[PDB]
Amino acid sequence: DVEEDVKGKLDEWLNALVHLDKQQVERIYEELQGEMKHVLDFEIINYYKLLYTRYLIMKRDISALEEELDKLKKVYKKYSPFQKLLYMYGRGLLCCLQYRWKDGLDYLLKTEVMAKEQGYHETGLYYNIALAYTHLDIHHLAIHFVNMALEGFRSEAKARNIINCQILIAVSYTEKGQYEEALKMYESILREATSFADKDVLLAITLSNMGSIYYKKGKYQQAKKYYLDSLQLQKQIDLNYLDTIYEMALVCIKLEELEEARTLIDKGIDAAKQEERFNAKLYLLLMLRYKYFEEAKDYKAFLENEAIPLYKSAGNKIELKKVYVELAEHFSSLSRFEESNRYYRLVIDLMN
Amino acid sequence: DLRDVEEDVKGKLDEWLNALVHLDKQQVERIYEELQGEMKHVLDFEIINYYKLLYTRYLIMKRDISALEEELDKLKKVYKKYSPFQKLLYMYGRGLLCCLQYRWKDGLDYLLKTEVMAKEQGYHETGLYYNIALAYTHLDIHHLAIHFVNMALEGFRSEAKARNIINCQILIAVSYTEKGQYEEALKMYESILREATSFADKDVLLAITLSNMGSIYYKKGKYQQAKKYYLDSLQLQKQIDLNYLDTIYEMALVCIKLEELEEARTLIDKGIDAAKQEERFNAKLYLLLMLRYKYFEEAKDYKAFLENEAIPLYKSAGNKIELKKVYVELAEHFSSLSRFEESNRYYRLVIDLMN
């Protein structure tokens, strides 16, 4: 009977896990570990076990999540409709963390239809669904859920999530649509003045995209300022950082600033050798240096003997296509259209 | 009085809806002719337009594209002020319109918005999921195609509609075929060979399966098997339609690989005359005509037909899939005539269509 407070304590831990109050999550997680050893009601135990999976995604532990999620898998039959709900939710987030967006979406969609049946709501769910749809390129459905997520997030007055939705919205309308509508969304982010944790991380991304938008619009001077501001906001060395440098180095070329361009390129290269995680990005910067600061004779040489054989290792995306097009454009520029056709045909075979 | 006249019409309109959703052709035609004698009595703006949107679905079922536009272009400006369900009917009809016109990318765009409106109104249609996946198939986006058939599949399962369930299985095996997994697709088609016998239209199910199987044996290299599966498919094709033109076009290619040109030459002429009759087959008519010129007409005449008739036709209608095919043939042609610069030109054009 005394474990009915733990039942309520498990519900309190649920609130801290939904609104992501990490300071409250940790104190309850510790308090429970001592009290969870005594209680032996499996509708109360499996409650904690599933909330732990929710705790694991907050602690970004994929491996431990996979372990536990596979354990609860067999016990799924005898769960409560709400406990059944949490399992489907956890696997969705797992696949999202494993970037299996199609598999995650299936789980997250079931997570929605269960929540509706038993009359349960969580604003984070809509966001994840929207993030799922977005990362696998379904625009209309992504926008649908990200609005409902945004509506709920405004009612909860959490500015961090507000921007996250606004970023997604602006990104989607940028992928296929007018930039003037996407720029105002980014502009709305900058005007926003509620200071929170890692707001500067979001602004770094916001500025990075605006730099890209204005780069496509031809407005190079403005784009460079946005790239510059982004870089100085960036505190990491992640993939998003190497992108902005590569993009900014392009702007310097457009603005007849080959010195600043090469400097940025060299820094990108030096920062890319650091890890094998972005080994692909490394050669993108090399190609850029051969293209503008080396002989075209050597640029072709690097593309044929270094670039192409590198992307034998899962360069299947734009990277390998990029190398083929550049070579194709190279020969057709020298009016040597035969070799140009050869590489052009390879581009078609790749985009099968 | 006039008031109860409409009350019964609304009921009869809702009945016409379910017949148009569950595809009851004999029931659709029945209510359709009945409504025409009743719809001239009702004058309610809400009810009249409700009928007009439903009438579009009739035109889709009757596959009357030329009349399908006129009804939609008549509503393209004012539909925004209708009831929210009338919008969904408009977006849906417009979506399938693009599909019937082989503008799948545009069709998908409308269908996806239709699904968004579906969730907004608390009303979904399992048939919609299928069409979305069908559009996703022609766009070669198979991972999303598979995503939507599974929703349609489980939808069709709960609705106990075993016939449409098979349609999903066929579509699944199609994506697997394009995904390179030929063996798992064949074994999937064999399972349909047993399932087919349970339905009335079994002969049209076999013709499709035997066709798609023959296509797999064609991609493997087993051409002698390819013809046998195609021949059995054609022998069941007693109805001249889209599927007929697919089988007879694909078989012609098989007779080319088997160096049986005379039979291939015969098949094309039969397929050409078939497509000339109904103008819904213009896409495949000029596709069949390209085969006629590629092998049995001189190269210059083949080139002339591509530049002056093929491209203009596939440019008028946004049938980019076929326009891609024409560009490659022109690119490969000039490449043989050592006119690489003009060949190179078309290679740049075909890449733009893939982005």
Residue numbers in the entry:
A (entry chain B): 67 to 418
B (entry chain A): 64 to 418
Paper's wording?
Previously, we showed that this process is regulated by the sensor NprR, which, in the presence of its cognate signaling peptide NprX, adopts a tetrameric conformation allowing its binding to specific DNA sequences and transcription of genes involved in survival of the bacteria in insect cadavers. Here, we demonstrate that, in the absence of NprX, NprR is a dimer, which negatively controls sporulation, independently of its transcription factor activity. We show that NprR prevents the phosphorylation of the phosphoprotein Spo0F and inhibits the phosphorylation cascade regulating sporulation. This demonstrates that NprX binding switches the bifunctional sensor NprR from a dimeric sporulation inhibitor to a tetrameric transcription factor. Interestingly, NprR contains both the HTH DNA-binding domain and the two Rap-like additional TPR motifs, and was thus proposed as an evolutionary intermediate in the RNPP family.
We thus used the truncated NprR(ΔHTH) form of the protein, deleted of the HTH domains, which are known to be highly flexible in the absence of DNA. Because crystallisation trials are performed at very high protein concentration favouring the tetrameric form of NprR, we also used the (Y223A/F225A) mutant that has been shown to impair tetramer formation. Crystals were finally obtained with the truncated double mutant protein NprR(ΔHTH)(Y223A/F225A). They diffracted up to 3.25Å resolution in space group P 21 21 21 with 2 molecules per asymmetric unit. In both polypeptide chains contained in the asymmetric unit, the 18 α-helices and the connecting loops forming the 9 TPR motifs of NprR are well defined. The two subunits (called apoA and apoB) display the right-handed superhelix conformation characteristic of TPR domains. They are associated into a stable dimer characterized by an overall interface area of 1113Å2 and a solvation free energy gain ΔiG of -18 kcal/mol. In particular, the dimerization interface involving the C-terminal residues N407 and Y410, which was observed in the NprR/NprX complex, is conserved in the apo dimer. Comparison of the two subunits of the apo NprR dimer demonstrated that, due to distinct crystal packing constraints, the pitch of the superhelix formed by the 9 TPR motifs of the protein is larger in apoB than in apoA. This discrepancy, characterized by a Z-score of 7.9 and an rmsd distance of 1.99Å over 293 aligned Cα atoms, reflects the elasticity of the superhelix and suggests that, in solution and in the absence of NprX, the protein dynamically oscillates between distinct conformations.
